[PDB]
Amino acid sequence: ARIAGVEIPRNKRVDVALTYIYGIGKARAKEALEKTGINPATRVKDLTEAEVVRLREYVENTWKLEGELRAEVAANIKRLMDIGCYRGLRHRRGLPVRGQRTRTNARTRKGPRKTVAGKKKAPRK
Amino acid sequence: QQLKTKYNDQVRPALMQQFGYSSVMAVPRIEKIVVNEGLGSSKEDSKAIDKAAKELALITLQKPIITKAKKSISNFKLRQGMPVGIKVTLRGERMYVFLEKLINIGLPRIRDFRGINPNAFDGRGNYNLGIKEQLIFPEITYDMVDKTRGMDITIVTTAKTDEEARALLQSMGLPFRK
Amino acid sequence: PRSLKKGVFVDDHLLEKVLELNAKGEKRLIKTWSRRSTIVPEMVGHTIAVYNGKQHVPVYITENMVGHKLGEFAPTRTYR
Amino acid sequence: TMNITSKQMEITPAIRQHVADRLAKLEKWQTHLINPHIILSKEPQGFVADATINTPNGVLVASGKHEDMYTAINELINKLERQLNKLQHK
RNA sequence: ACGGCCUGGGCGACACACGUGCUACAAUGCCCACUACAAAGCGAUGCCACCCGGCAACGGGGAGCUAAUCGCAAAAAGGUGGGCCCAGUUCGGAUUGGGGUCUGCAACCCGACCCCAUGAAGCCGGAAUCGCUAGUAAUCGCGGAUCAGCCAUGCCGCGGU
């Protein structure tokens, strides 16, 4: 469904194709169908440009998201990383910034996954 | 004619409307164009790049020859007739109607695209700015496609003085850093 | 993310002192011992200094640092 | 790989290098052992050293109580070595 | 004074070694609809039916409860069909910014919980090693205890099978 940026979901029903995009979820998948009076049990390719227009206008009329939000992907944290932010802090440090630990259960940012030399003499349990 | 005319009688008199010049051909013309790209033979030791060669002619047909840089490396790569380049001469009148797919398309996409070039310019009518890795075209599958451009565009215009280098290149088309 | 509905906690056992800098006169550098308080527009852009538990830290609320619970800017941990 | 603890003294680079040097030397013994742990104690009669190692084929244990702190540690690992010897049997 | 009142800070850090446990590699599953089933306790300053907002997390009027006689809970898994066809998959879900609730004159550190986006290791994992002789192991769920609050994947108890 090439209608915006690298969006080409296809070869199935449309209901699926909906959420089947980096930005669409639930309140955006079938919820949009309603606002456009379309049944979920439809084909994607079949929808000629005619149907595509409804999406090209109504659907494409989204806020800063997916294909356009590519201008705030980091900005969403640009104002809470450097600065003396905890997240820095966890920002200045680019570590998880939302109530949790750092030793473990946050290995997303701090340390990728590469096996660290495990502690030897200091209870590992 | 079309743009050529909105270039022969539109963005041609304006210059004299601002401040003339000793000639009715004094105004800058379509000096040089070309395109420039070719990020060196990446995919394969020169044998799969062909699937990135013809990809240069991914808008029209005019069999580019890739050229070569200068053989002296023997570090990175480079030999007696390697690629590393581009160029190709394809100006003309349709080249005007080619701005139709230039001074138009692209802008409607290219990431956070808002304006075109922040001053910079000067010296010549060849302001070096352009492309990333986006075509903005669907006139073929674009699924079977799988390359990665990069580089920019040059196109000179016989506009030495800044107030020519980037003067006409303002009321020139419309898509630009406003 | 973080929240409290309303009434963002602001250490007021010191607010009276922090507001002295803007009640009849001005002055720089005041002492502090906290990391819970929140800052309000009324008192921004002033030389401050708070503690950690055993350590002291440099403080100065500016536009670039939304004056919140504060502690979320200089916890305590230290390593290498 | 090598953890040494004690509730009386501290871990010095010498005691670490001593035991550590013996680990790298125990090549013929190198086969399993996953995150070993050694503890050091002390009694009015001398010093004691205990060690525990977990392996994919079981667990080994060793202890020492020589009057000399260093001797005990050396003796303990001696049992580690002597223990692995019986593991291969003959 | 290795006596004493206090605000904060480490124990939710770090190049790391594995144990203990939870949850997954799926198609047996993703989700839509309805529904037949277990023990057990506990709710005195304590718990929740109903009323309406409401994406809910949630709220306010406060009935009722010291009780086979009101609640905690329309148990979960499951069952019939529906749509989904093997790709790193509507798997799993660590995970990051912007917002919300409940405890606290407060939740940076260091809260679980509701939404928006979100999404890795991973197609059984070199060795090595554990449990049980029956209702077993195994899979899916519930309460109690403590705790003012809050983050039970821990603890004790019980069951659908």
Added chain:
RNA sequence: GGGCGGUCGCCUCCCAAAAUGUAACGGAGGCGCCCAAAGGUCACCUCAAGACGGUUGGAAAUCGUCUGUAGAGCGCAAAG
């Protein structure tokens, strides 16, 4: 000087003494080829190198440009 070692043919000169113009246990680079084509004909193109900022582009490889006693290169020393 014996002589182990080292020397035994061709080619670049330094020193050879501005025509030719020698030596040397005085010194430095090599070889006894290449190529159906770097051979013959006709044609166009000045090379390294800096700067202008733009690509996978933490120099450098891409391109436009002026400069360029042209500092490239023309099959491997050297002079011309």
